[PDB]
Design a protein around this ligand. Structure first.
Ligand SMILES: CCCCCCCCCCCCCCCC(=O)N[C@@H](CO[C@H]1O[C@H](CO)[C@H](O)[C@H](O)[C@H]1O)[C@H](O)[C@H](O)CCCCCCCCCCCCCC
Ligand SMILES: *[C@@H]1O[C@H](CO)[C@@H](O[C@@H]2O[C@H](CO)[C@@H](O)[C@H](O)[C@H]2NC(C)=O)[C@H](O)[C@H]1NC(C)=O
Ligand SMILES: *[C@@H]1O[C@H](CO)[C@@H](O)[C@H](O)[C@H]1NC(C)=O
Lengths: 271, 98
């Protein structure tokens, strides 16, 4: 279960900007930070981790000063470099705990939907093939010792200590297993004398899963995987389809493999 | 720079007429993040909930909008999506079968 802190910043004109934050641990969202709010919100009882109220308050103050400063600082880069409007900036930052004691952290960012810069070891490094001016934004950002120090601390002290504690408090919820329902339906016609067999699987946690159309032990190819799509309760949904002649439909089944079931797959025959 | 929304609609549970359920409309792969997602019963907006906006590895956004509903014989459902890459609001029908 890796940790990802996520920032979405919209600068439309100069009177109107918003910055939103949220954070994922594994598949679950333990934090949100709405523009309207001066404080992060804990979405789960385990969200607070092992951090004390003081550590949380300090981390908050830093981030709140950051958000304010980020806002005005972008606007200055905008006016003093005549960049376009609107602007969408996103930032992703996080880490994961690897075996032994090694932990790798990161902070990359995006301008207009693609990579633009990141943070490597001790300094801001620009991303290959990026708009002309950001090499010059990188110039300024590298002359701000304080911000560079604060980022380093965050990535190397704060995220790892936060994730260790939240991995502990959230263990039972993170590692839980929810069994899927499954059901069959006849879908839109692929042609005269054809059927679209549709197997639906819904309500499994976690996300890795395997759903195939079968004839005995031989997997039917022609099986088209849907995307795995979220439900509101942090479970998932997937539909898997088969374009088959209405004649050859007998003996077909849909088999569902999921970590929650063991070696006891769900099996459904077409009736 | 600019990506259009992909839209999928599906119910939470097997869709049995009469039994309360959840209708899900999943909008993803888009950019800019500004978007509007309405769930419609027979053309009319219904009370729905939206998750926090988020994004994937490649910086494109996604959003889950869900609402309670009770499917039956007559009523038809759909999802309406307005985005800057769509000159007319895009509409996607709920197909119980797919
Ligand atoms: C818990 C879930 C919430 C999710 C939150 C998402 C995580 C986002 C990452 C957090 C970044 C943390 C960095 C904090 C460093 C910081 O405070 N930077 C601030 C604050 O500095 C201010 O206070 C300091 C000390 O108190 C100094 O005195 C400064 O002079 C003063 O200006 C800094 O000034 C400035 O805002 C840095 C901006 C970073 C921008 C890098 C992002 C790349 C965007 C590139 C966009 C391209 C340009 C478009 C025009
Ligand atoms: C900054 O941007 C917002 C739109 O992103 C503008 O707000 C709109 O302004 C019109 C006309 O005044 C209002 O009727 C709308 O209700 C607003 N829409 C939204 C989505 O906010 C705002 O006018 C812009 N301001 C400047 C100074 O350019
Ligand atoms: C969001 O927050 C900022 C800073 O607190 C505020 O000044 C601004 O008006 C807000 N933006 C929007 C779009 O509501």
């Amino acid at each position: 279960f890796s940790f990802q802190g996520l920032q979405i910043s919209s600068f439309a004109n100069r009177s109107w900007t918003r910055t939103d934050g949220l954070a994922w641990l594994g598949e679950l969202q333990p934090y949100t930070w709405r523009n309207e709010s001066d404080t992060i919100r804990f979405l789960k009882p385990w969200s607070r981790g092992t951090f004390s109220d003081q550590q949380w308050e300090q981390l908050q103050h830093t981030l709140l000063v950051y958000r304010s400063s980020f806002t005005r600082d972008i606007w200055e880069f905008v006016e003093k470099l005549h960049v376009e409007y609107p602007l969408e900036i996103q930032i992703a930052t996080g880490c994961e705990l690897l075996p032994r004691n090694i932990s790798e952290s990161f902070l990359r960012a995006a301008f207009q939907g693609r990579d633009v810069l990141s943070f490597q070891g001790m300094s801001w490094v620009s991303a290959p093939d990026a708009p002309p001016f950001i090499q010059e934004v990188i110039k300024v950002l590298n002359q701000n010792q304080g911000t560079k120090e604060t980022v380093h601390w965050l990535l190397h002290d704060i995220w790892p200590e936060l994730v260790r504690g939240v991995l502990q408090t959230g263990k039972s919820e993170l590692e839980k297993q929810v069994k899927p329902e499954a059901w069959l339906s006849s879908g839109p016609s692929p042609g005269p004398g054809r059927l679209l067999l549709v197997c639906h699987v819904s309500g499994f946690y976690p996300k890795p899963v395997r759903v195939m159309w079968m004839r005995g032990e031989q997997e039917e190819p022609g099986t088209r995987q849907g995307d795995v799509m979220p439900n509101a309760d942090s479970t998932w949904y997937l539909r898997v389809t088969l374009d088959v002649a209405a004649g050859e439909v007998a003996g077909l089944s849909c088999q569902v493999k999921h970590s929650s079931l063991g070696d006891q797959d769900i099996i459904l025959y077409w009736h | 720079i600019q990506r259009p929304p992909k839209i999928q609609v599906y119910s939470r549970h097997p869709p049995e007429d009469g039994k309360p359920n959840y209708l899900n409309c999943y909008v993803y792969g888009f950019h800019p993040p500004q978007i509007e997602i309405d769930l419609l019963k027979n053309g009319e907006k219904i009370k729905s909930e939206q998750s926090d906006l988020s994004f994937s590895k490649d910086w494109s956004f996604y959003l889950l909008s869900h609402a309670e509903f009770t499917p039956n014989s007559k009523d038809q459902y759909s999802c309406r999506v307005k985005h800057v890459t769509l000159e007319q609001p895009r509409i996607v029908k709920w197909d119980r079968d797919l």
